[PDB]
Coordinates of C-alpha atoms and ligand atoms in Angstrom, one line a residue:
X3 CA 27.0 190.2 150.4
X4 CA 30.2 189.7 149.5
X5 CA 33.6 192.3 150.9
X6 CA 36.6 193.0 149.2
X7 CA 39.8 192.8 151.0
X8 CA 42.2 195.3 151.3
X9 CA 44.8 193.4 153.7
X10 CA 46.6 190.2 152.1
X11 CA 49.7 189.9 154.3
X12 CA 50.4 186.2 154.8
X13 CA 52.2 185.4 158.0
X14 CA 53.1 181.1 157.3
X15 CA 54.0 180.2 161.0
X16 CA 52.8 181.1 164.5
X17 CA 56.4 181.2 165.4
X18 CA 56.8 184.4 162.8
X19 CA 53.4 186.0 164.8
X20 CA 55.4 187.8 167.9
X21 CA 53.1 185.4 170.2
X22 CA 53.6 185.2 174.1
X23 CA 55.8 181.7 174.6
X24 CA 52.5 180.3 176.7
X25 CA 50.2 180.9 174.2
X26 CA 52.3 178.9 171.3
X27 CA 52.5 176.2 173.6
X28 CA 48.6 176.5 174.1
X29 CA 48.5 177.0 170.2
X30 CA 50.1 173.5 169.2
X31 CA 48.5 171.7 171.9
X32 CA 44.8 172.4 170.5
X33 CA 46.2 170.3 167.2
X34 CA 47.6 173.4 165.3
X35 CA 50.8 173.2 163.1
X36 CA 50.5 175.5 160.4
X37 CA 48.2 178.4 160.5
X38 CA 44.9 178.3 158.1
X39 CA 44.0 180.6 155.2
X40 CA 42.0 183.2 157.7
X41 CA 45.0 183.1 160.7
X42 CA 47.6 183.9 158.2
X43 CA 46.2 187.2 157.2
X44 CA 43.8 188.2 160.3
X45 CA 45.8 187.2 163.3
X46 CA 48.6 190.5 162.8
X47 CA 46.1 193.1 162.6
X48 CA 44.5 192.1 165.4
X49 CA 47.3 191.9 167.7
X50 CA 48.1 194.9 166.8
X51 CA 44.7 196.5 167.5
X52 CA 43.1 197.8 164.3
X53 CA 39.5 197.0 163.5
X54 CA 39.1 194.0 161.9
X55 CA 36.2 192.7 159.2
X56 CA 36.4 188.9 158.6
X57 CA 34.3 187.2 156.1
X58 CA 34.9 183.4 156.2
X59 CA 32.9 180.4 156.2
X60 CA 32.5 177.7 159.1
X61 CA 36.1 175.2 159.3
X62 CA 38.3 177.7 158.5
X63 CA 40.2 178.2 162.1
X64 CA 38.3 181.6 162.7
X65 CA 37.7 181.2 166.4
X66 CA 41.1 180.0 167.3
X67 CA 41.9 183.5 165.3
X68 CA 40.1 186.0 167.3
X69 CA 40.8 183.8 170.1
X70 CA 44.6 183.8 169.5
X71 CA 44.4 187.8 169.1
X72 CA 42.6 188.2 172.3
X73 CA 44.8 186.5 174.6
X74 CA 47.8 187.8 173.0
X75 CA 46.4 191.2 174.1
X76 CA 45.3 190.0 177.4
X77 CA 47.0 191.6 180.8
X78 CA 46.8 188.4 183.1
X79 CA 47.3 190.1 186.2
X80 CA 44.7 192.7 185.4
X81 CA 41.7 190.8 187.5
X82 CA 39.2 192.5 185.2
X83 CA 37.3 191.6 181.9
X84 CA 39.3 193.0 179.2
X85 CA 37.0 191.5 176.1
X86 CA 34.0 190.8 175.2
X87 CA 32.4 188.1 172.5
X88 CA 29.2 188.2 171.1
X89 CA 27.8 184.9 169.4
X90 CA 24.3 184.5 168.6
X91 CA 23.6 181.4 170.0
X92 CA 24.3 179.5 173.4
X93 CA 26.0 177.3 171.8
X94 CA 28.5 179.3 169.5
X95 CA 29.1 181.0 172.8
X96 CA 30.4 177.7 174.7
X97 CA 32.2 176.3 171.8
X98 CA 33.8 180.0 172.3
X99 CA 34.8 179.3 175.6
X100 CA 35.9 176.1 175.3
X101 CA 38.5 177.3 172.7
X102 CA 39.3 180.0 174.4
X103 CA 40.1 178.1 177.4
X104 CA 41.9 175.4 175.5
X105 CA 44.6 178.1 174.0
X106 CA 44.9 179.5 177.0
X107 CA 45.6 176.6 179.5
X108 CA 49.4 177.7 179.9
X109 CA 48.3 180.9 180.6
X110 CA 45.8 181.1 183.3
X111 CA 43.2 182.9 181.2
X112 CA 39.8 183.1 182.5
X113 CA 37.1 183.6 180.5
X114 CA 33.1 182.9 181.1
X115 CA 30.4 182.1 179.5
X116 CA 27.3 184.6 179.8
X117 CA 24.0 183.0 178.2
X118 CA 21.2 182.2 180.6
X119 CA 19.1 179.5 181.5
X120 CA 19.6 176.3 183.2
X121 CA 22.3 177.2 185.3
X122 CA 21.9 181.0 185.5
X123 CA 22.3 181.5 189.2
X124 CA 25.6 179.6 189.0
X125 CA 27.1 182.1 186.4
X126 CA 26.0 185.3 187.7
X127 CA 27.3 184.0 191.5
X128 CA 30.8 183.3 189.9
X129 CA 31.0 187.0 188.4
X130 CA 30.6 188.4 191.9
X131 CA 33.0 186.3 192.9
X132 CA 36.4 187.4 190.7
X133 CA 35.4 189.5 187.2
X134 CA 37.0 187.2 183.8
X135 CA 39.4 188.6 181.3
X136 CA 37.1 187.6 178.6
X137 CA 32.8 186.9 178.8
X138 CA 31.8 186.0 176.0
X139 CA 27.4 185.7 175.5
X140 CA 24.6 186.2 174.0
X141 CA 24.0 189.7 173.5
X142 CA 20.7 190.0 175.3
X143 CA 22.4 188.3 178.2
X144 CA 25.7 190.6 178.3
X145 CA 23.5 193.7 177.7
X146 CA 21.5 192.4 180.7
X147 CA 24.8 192.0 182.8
X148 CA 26.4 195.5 181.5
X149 CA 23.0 196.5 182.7
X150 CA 22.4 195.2 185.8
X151 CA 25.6 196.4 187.0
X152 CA 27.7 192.6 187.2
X153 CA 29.7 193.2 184.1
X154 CA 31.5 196.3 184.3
X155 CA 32.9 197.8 181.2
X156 CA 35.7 199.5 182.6
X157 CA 38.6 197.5 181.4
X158 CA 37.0 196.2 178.0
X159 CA 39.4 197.3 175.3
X160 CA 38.5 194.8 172.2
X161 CA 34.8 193.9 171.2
X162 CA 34.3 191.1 168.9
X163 CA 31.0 189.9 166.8
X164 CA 31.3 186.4 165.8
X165 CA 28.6 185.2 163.0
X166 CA 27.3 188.7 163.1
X167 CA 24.6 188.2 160.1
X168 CA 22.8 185.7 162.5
X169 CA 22.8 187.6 165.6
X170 CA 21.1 190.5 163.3
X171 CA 18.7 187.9 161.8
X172 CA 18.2 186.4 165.2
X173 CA 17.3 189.9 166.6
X174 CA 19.6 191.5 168.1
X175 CA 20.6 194.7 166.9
X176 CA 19.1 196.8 169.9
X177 CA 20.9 195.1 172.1
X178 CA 24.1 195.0 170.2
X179 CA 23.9 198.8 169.8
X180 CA 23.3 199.3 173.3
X181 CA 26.2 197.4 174.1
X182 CA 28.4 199.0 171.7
X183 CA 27.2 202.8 173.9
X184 CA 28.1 201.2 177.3
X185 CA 31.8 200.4 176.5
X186 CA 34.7 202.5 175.5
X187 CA 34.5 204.5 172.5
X188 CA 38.1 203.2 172.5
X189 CA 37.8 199.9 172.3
X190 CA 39.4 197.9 169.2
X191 CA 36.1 195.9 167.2
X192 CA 36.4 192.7 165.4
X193 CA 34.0 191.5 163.4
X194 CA 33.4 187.6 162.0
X195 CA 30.8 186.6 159.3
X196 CA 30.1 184.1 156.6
X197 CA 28.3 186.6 154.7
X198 CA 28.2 190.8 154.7
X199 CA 24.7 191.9 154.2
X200 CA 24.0 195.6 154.9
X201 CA 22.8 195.3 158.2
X202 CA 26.2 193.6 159.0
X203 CA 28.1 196.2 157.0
X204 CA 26.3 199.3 158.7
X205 CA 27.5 197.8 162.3
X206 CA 31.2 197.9 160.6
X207 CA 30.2 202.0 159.8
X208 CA 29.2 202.7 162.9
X209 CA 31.6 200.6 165.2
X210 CA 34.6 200.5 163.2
X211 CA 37.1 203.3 161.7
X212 CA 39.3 202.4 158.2
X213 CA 38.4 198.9 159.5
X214 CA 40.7 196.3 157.6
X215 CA 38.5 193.4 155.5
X216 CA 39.8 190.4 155.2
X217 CA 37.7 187.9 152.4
X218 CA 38.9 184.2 152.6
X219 CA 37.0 183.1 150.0
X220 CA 35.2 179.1 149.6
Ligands
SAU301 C1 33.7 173.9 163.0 N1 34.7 174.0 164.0 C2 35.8 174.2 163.2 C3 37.1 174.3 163.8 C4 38.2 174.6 163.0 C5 39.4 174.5 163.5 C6 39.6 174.3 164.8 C7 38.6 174.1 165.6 C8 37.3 174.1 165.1 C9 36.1 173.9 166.0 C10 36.3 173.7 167.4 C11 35.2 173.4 168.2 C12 33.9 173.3 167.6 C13 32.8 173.0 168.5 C14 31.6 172.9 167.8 C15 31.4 173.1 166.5 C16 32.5 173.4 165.7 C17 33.7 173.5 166.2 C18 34.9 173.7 165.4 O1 30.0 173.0 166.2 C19 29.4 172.4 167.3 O2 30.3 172.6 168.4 O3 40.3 174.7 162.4 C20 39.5 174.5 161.2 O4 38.2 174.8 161.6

């Protein structure tokens, strides 16, 4: 499926977005100049906390978006995970990471990645150790760490779904449900996807109220 928008305010420059001075330094020294198509119109109703539906195809700039949003938001002397990324693959969720950690270099940002496997041990040790300000995982991963008690959702105040029709055709709906009960009902929800079937769209029902939509079209 296919959205219709009903937010088309273009912002042209990062310096006109109201950013922290730390992360426009972090901004233009991941390669940026100019914000893309999606930034210019999704980056503002973030900030400013309002539910957000994105559809938008692969090389548009739509992880450095949310990513921008979310540390924009972030309080860095808060020690405590403020948000929380779902991706549908273990390697969505590292490129994640890695961007995230990129734009937030002048910062001092944490953020982990929660996804299993080879090097599990490590990842749940480190969480013990000091809590992130952002995790973002797989969602049976976080829902096992929500669940499990090492993730708490306390402080998590935005929520965002990134490729959302594949984590649904991947599987994960229970789990993204069950997430969605153990945090806030006051947390702000983003939500990222090339297309909008129903399945997608009845997560925006159910997570999101007078959501804006955002198309950037190919
Ligand atoms: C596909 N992409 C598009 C991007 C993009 C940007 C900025 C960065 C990215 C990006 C950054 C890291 C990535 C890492 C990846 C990847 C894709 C990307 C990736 O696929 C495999 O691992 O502005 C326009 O669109």
């Amino acid at each position: 499926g296919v959205i219709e928008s009903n937010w088309n305010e273009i912002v042209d420059s990062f310096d006109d977005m109201n950013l922290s001075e730390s992360l426009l330094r972090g901004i233009y020294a991941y390669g940026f100049e100019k914000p893309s198509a999606i930034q210019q119109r999704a980056i503002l109703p973030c900030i400013k906390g309002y539910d957000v539906i994105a559809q938008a195809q692969s090389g548009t700039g739509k992880t450095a978006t949310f990513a921008i949003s979310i540390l924009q938001q972030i309080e860095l002397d808060l020690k405590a995970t403020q948000a929380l990324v779902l991706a549908p693959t273990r390697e969505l969720a590292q490129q994640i990471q890695k961007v995230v950690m990129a734009l937030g270099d002048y910062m001092g940002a944490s953020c982990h990645a929660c996804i299993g496997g080879t090097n599990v041990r490590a990842e749940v040790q480190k969480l013990q150790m000091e809590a992130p300000h952002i995790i973002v995982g797989t969602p049976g991963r976080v829902f096992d760490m929500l669940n499990r008690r090492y993730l708490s959702p306390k402080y998590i105040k935005m929520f965002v779904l990134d490729e959302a029709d594949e984590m649904l055709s991947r599987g994960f709906k229970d789990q993204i449900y069950d997430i969605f009960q153990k945090l806030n009902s006051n947390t702000q929800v983003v939500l990222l996807s090339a297309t909008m079937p129903s399945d997608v769209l009845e997560v925006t029902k159910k997570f999101m109220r007078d959501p804006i939509r955002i198309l950037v079209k190919k």
